[PDB]
């Protein structure tokens, strides 16, 4: 898994894994490449 700068991959105990970005301020269930 490539980790891009500004992104945090955070898995909550409910089984909620959201990829969030502080750069553009966006979150997605998909794995970001860039």
């Amino acid at each position: 898994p490539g980790l891009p700068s500004g992104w945090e991959e955070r898995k909550d105990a409910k089984g909620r894994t959201y990829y969030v970005n502080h750069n553009n301020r966006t979150t997605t269930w998909t794995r970001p490449i860039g």
Partner: peptide, 15 residues
């Protein structure tokens, strides 16, 4: 994941 679209991101993540 087929999950409903992630919670609106402002500054910090909240779920």
């Amino acid at each position: 994941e087929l999950e409903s679209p992630p919670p609106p991101y402002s500054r910090y993540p909240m779920d």
